[PDB]
Design a protein around this nucleic acid. Structure first.
Ligand SMILES: [Mg+2]
Ligand SMILES: [Mg+2]
Ligand SMILES: [Mg+2]
Ligand SMILES: [Mg+2]
Ligand SMILES: [Mg+2]
Ligand SMILES: [Mg+2]
Ligand SMILES: [Mg+2]
Ligand SMILES: [Mg+2]
Ligand SMILES: [Mg+2]
Ligand SMILES: [Mg+2]
Ligand SMILES: [Mg+2]
Ligand SMILES: [Mg+2]
Ligand SMILES: [Mg+2]
Ligand SMILES: [Mg+2]
Ligand SMILES: [Mg+2]
Ligand SMILES: [Mg+2]
Ligand SMILES: [Mg+2]
Ligand SMILES: [Mg+2]
Ligand SMILES: [Mg+2]
Ligand SMILES: [Mg+2]
Ligand SMILES: [Mg+2]
Ligand SMILES: [Mg+2]
Ligand SMILES: [Mg+2]
Ligand SMILES: [Mg+2]
Ligand SMILES: [Mg+2]
Ligand SMILES: [Mg+2]
Ligand SMILES: [Mg+2]
Ligand SMILES: [Mg+2]
Ligand SMILES: [Mg+2]
Ligand SMILES: [Mg+2]
Ligand SMILES: [Mg+2]
Ligand SMILES: [Mg+2]
Ligand SMILES: [Mg+2]
Ligand SMILES: [Mg+2]
Ligand SMILES: [Mg+2]
Ligand SMILES: [Mg+2]
Ligand SMILES: [Mg+2]
Ligand SMILES: [Mg+2]
Ligand SMILES: [Mg+2]
Ligand SMILES: [Zn+2]
Lengths: 98, 155, 60, 112, 206, 24
RNA sequence: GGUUUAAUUCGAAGCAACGCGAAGAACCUUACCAGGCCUUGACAUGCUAGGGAACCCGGGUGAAAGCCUGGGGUGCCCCGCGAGGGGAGCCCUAGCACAGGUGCUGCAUGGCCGUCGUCAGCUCGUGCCGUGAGGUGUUGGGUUAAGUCCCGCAACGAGCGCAACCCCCGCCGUUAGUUGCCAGCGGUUCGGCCGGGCACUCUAACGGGACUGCCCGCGAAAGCGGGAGGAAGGAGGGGACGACGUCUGGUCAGCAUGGCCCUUACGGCCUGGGCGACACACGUGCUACAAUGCCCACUACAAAGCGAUGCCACCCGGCAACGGGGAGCUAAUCGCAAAAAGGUGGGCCCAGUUCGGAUUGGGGUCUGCAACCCGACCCCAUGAAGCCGGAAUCGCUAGUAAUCGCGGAUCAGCCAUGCCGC
RNA sequence: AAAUGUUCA
């Protein structure tokens, strides 16, 4: 019960809050199946380096979107007021699915 | 190769008869990385050397390989605006390399419609005596002879 | 003919087939990635400045 | 810690410094006089010294410019026997002019 | 015709992002537009205060916006006001509540964007066709950097034949990832045309 | 046959399906 | 390229222009042409005065644009009553100051790029040499992928480069269990599907491992040769990264910018055309000429990516393309998939063929207002040149070449046989 | 023992 998925471009600030949420939920009862690392979606862009005309020669780019999963098996009112208020996301986004 | 001497790739022994050869050959039979279909063609080549002779493939094989490999050849020396054929012996490595090349080469020259039959039949003629490959080998032989006069300078 | 066009595109003026993508930084018509709304000259110009969230030199 | 890669790079370095330094490290604002054995052999040394108005006291022999020498010790420049004697007495004179003293520092090498 | 942006080359490491904030392929595109027009008005109105780097963070659908200026008094003053307006304009062009925090610079001439400017104004002020450069680098070095570089390109002194003058002093390994070299681009608009100034400042390492 | 629309290969190549390459 | 054309748009020009800008030309895009229209203008900042003013729906004309015409409205403010009157956006006309130019110059420029060249080089500080330009250092021997290192030496050091620091791949560990599995027993509608389980695999996070460390040999040393151990060595395999500079290199048509130039037009709008022309030349490619091949049925084994007015299972009509229905899927949970070459069975029997598919007629489908110029698919019927290519000429040293298929950006659709990737 | 093998801001 209460599955929480968190995505991020930075894998550090992600795993960061990823645990911060875990360490929290436990700190109120409720079991929590550790943050599992779901596969990454890589989005790349290949552009001509030059503005004019030099088709051979380009620069690759990628926007790696990281995903982490965290399940708290048996929640309760205590494991809500925390994970429904107490935050810390700046470059990370979480979706709560009950 | 400016730095130093090449280095020959060691081939994987044959799964059937084993032997470093057979693969070398099979590798020459093959095209487009389309092996299997090539290794097969070679084994398939028994029908014609098996019950067609009863001598044992591998043994005949190794006998053709020996009769179709050259012992001398002509190259081409960069003389001042001359460019001559010039004799020169042949390396053990080139002998085998050349021998297997012409074998398959001469093999796909024959009129039979089926590949498995072209080889083997060519291996057989070659096995001893004639064979398009042996003829090719007998010519590179002539050159080195027909130009024994330009042997005075060998590189 | 730039300004006249950059805006001529911002507007809806009939049908949906006549509409088209065009760089949000420069007026660029071709080579604009819809994920950024940027043309490939700008995409690089900004990527190097670290102004495109996430996004960095590839290498694999 | 320092990556073993540099460890050699550095320890290999002081080795050439220690080899090309172990001795000249006692210098403190140029010397008041240079003592060379073979002026001709150490021409460079003489030139530099002489350029800086430093006295030059060498012990060369037939085959060197005695004019470039402010205090000559005309004598053999090759035989260990000859060098050792002259340096020995020079140094003895040095200490004696400051403070004892003997005995005869281990100079003898093997003399054949 | 070569050399990649010293910044974009480090990003992931050594350097950071000028604007960090996740986004969905459904919003990202947009969220980006705002960032750009938010840095837009701030590049013109805060030019006077010598601003270098406009960090933009986005949390619960918000907007941080941190301006690192060499003179925080230019955006606020010697008392307390002004800015109060900028905050109103940032929302005037963005139907959002955008914060706006000022910042300072440990040392104004230890920041590439700033150094490759200020004196590189002396160029639009018809002066120092060179020494302006040699002067900057000294200031950087003097301020304890480990190496600095400045390059001016264009109709220097107003000439007809475009030229290129660069500094020279301290370490500046553009090939080292763990370097941490700052980089800033000028652009001097003159009666005789555009002149580009590049400043490189090598700070610490490892 | 890659350019022969009326065949297996022909279809695969063109990136289409039909009487000669049914959608399974 | 050239030649045509009302226009066929502009640039790029040996290598380093020519599947290049173009990562998507039917109208849009477009910069070109013809014709019809608008001028403070499609939009920016403001100032004056009549007035009107947020907005929304029609009629006429027309190809559209445009022009003409008729329908309707005060939260703000004064206590001033209100119907007298001022005012804020804001909308309009008219005038003013200005807008716009993809018009020119890369030989006035910035910025970015190409290129020599990932070549191993290019310099500086003090010292010494020479009247001086300059030299030495950095000439020499050996060694290296390398100005890498070693040994020499009037030089001793240092910087920009090389290397290393960053990513990927190779072996293993720790953390982690809606992917994985009888791996172990259990039940099974015999699908890990259900309890159950983290061991495998895997996903991903920061760690371990390698360095000529060890043995033998040569050597002055650097290093070279060889052997052991090891997943891996002697830079383990790839990336990213391209020094002072050279090309008056490339781009004023991405952008920016000095100067020159046009402002009832060299600006703006619209419909239609054109950029798709065709006696010819060249570049890059695709499909081939076939039996190691082709065709058909059946049956396997990937990776990397992409998806909500999107990917679209599964049904059903149709021979098809598609069309109706319609589940799941905010997607390691659904699907685009199925990979192809392979394997197995059958067919073809050396022929311009069951090789090859051009071309042409005809009948349909789908996107879009619209597919005459000019789209892509499907089906029937045609079925061309080609059975191996002159002088010449290109690519590649290994999981490379060769060959087979898959994905993506752009994108309604697609002229992609291109490109970046697997 | 390279037969020869021109020109151009
Ligand atoms: Mg190309
Ligand atoms: Mg379109
Ligand atoms: Mg056919
Ligand atoms: Mg043209
Ligand atoms: Mg032009
Ligand atoms: Mg257009
Ligand atoms: Mg058009
Ligand atoms: Mg038009
Ligand atoms: Mg021009
Ligand atoms: Mg130019
Ligand atoms: Mg130029
Ligand atoms: Mg330029
Ligand atoms: Mg190299
Ligand atoms: Mg002289
Ligand atoms: Mg002098
Ligand atoms: Mg010098
Ligand atoms: Mg010097
Ligand atoms: Mg020199
Ligand atoms: Mg070096
Ligand atoms: Mg030296
Ligand atoms: Mg393991
Ligand atoms: Mg593991
Ligand atoms: Mg490097
Ligand atoms: Mg040009
Ligand atoms: Mg321009
Ligand atoms: Mg057209
Ligand atoms: Mg065209
Ligand atoms: Mg046409
Ligand atoms: Mg081909
Ligand atoms: Mg049916
Ligand atoms: Mg068969
Ligand atoms: Mg059409
Ligand atoms: Mg036919
Ligand atoms: Mg014919
Ligand atoms: Mg034939
Ligand atoms: Mg190579
Ligand atoms: Mg498409
Ligand atoms: Mg067509
Ligand atoms: Mg003449
Ligand atoms: Zn742009």
């Amino acid at each position: 019960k209460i599955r929480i998925k968190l995505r991020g471009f930075d894998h550090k600030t992600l795993d960061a809050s990823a645990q911060k949420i875990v360490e929290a939920a436990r700190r109120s009862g409720a079991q929590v199946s550790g943050p599992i690392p779901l596969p990454t979606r890589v989005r790349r862009f290949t552009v001509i380096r030059g503005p004019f005309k030099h088709k051979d020669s380009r620069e690759h780019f990628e926007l790696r979107t990281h995903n982490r999963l965290v399940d708290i098996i048996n929640p309760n009112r205590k494991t809500i007021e925390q994970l429904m208020t107490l935050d810390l996301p700046t470059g990370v986004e979480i979706e709560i699915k009950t | 190769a400016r730095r130093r001497r090449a280095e020959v790739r060691q081939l994987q022994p044959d799964l059937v008869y084993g032997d470093v050869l057979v693969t070398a050959f099979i590798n020459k039979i093959m095209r487009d990385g389309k092996k299997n279909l090539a290794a097969r063609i070679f084994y398939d080549a028994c029908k014609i050397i098996q019950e067609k002779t009863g001598q044992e493939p591998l043994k005949v094989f190794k006998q053709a390989v020996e009769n179709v490999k050259p012992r001398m050849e002509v190259r081409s020396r960069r003389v001042g605006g001359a460019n001559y054929q010039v004799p020169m012996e042949v390396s053990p490595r080139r002998q085998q390399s050349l021998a297997l090349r012409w074998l398959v080469q001469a093999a796909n020259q024959r009129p039979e419609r089926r590949a498995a039959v072209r080889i083997a039949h060519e291996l057989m003629d070659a096995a001893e005596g004639k064979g398009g490959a042996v003829k090719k080998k007998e010519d590179v032989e002539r050159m080195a002879e027909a130009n024994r006069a330009y042997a005075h300078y060998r590189w | 003919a730039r300004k006249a066009l950059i805006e001529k595109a911002k507007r809806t003026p009939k049908f949906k087939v006549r509409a088209y993508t065009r760089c949000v930084r420069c007026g660029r018509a071709r080579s604009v990635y819809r994920f950024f709304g940027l043309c490939r000259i700008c995409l690089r110009e900004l990527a190097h400045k670290g102004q495109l969230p996430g996004v960095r030199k590839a290498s694999w | 810690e320092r990556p073993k890669k540099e460890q050699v790079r550095l320890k290999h370095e002081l080795e050439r410094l220690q080899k090309y330094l172990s001795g000249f490290r006692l210098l403190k604002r140029l010397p008041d006089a240079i003592f060379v054995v073979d002026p001709t052999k150490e021409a460079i040394a003489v030139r530099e010294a002489r350029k800086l108005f430093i006295p030059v006291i060498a012990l060369a022999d037939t085959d060197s410019d005695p004019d470039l020498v402010d205090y000559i010790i005309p004598g053999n420049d090759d035989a260990i026997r000859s060098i050792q004697l002259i340096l020995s007495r020079a140094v003895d004179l040095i200490i004696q002019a400051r403070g004892g003293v003997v005995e005869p520092s281990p100079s003898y090498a093997l003399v054949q | 015709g070569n050399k990649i942006h010293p910044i974009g080359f480090r990003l992931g490491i050594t350097r950071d992002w000028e604007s960090r904030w996740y986004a969905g392929k459904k919003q990202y595109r947009h969220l980006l537009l705002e960032d750009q027009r938010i840095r837009g008005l701030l590049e013109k109105e805060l030019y006077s205060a010598g601003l270098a780097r406009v960090d933009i963070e986005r949390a619960a659908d918000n907007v941080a916006v941190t301006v690192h200026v060499a003179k925080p008094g230019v955006v606020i003053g010697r008392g307390g006001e002004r800015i109060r307006v900028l905050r109103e304009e940032l929302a005037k062009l963005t139907g959002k509540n955008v914060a706006l925090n000022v910042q300072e610079v440990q040392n104004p001439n230890l920041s590439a964007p700033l150094v490759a400017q200020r004196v590189a104004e002396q160029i639009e002020r018809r002066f120092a066709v060179r020494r302006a450069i040699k002067q900057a680098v000294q200031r950087v070095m003097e301020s304890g950097a480990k190496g600095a570089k400045v390059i001016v390109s264009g109709r220097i002194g107003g000439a007809e034949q475009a030229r290129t003058e660069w500094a020279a002093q301290g370490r500046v390994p553009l090939h080292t990832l763990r370097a941490n070299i700052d980089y800033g681009f000028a652009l001097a608009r003159t009666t005789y045309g555009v002149l580009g100034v590049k400043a490189y400042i090598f700070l610490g390492e490892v | 046959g890659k350019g022969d629309r009326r065949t297996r290969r022909g279809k695969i190549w063109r990136g289409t399906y039909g009487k000669y390459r049914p959608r399974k």
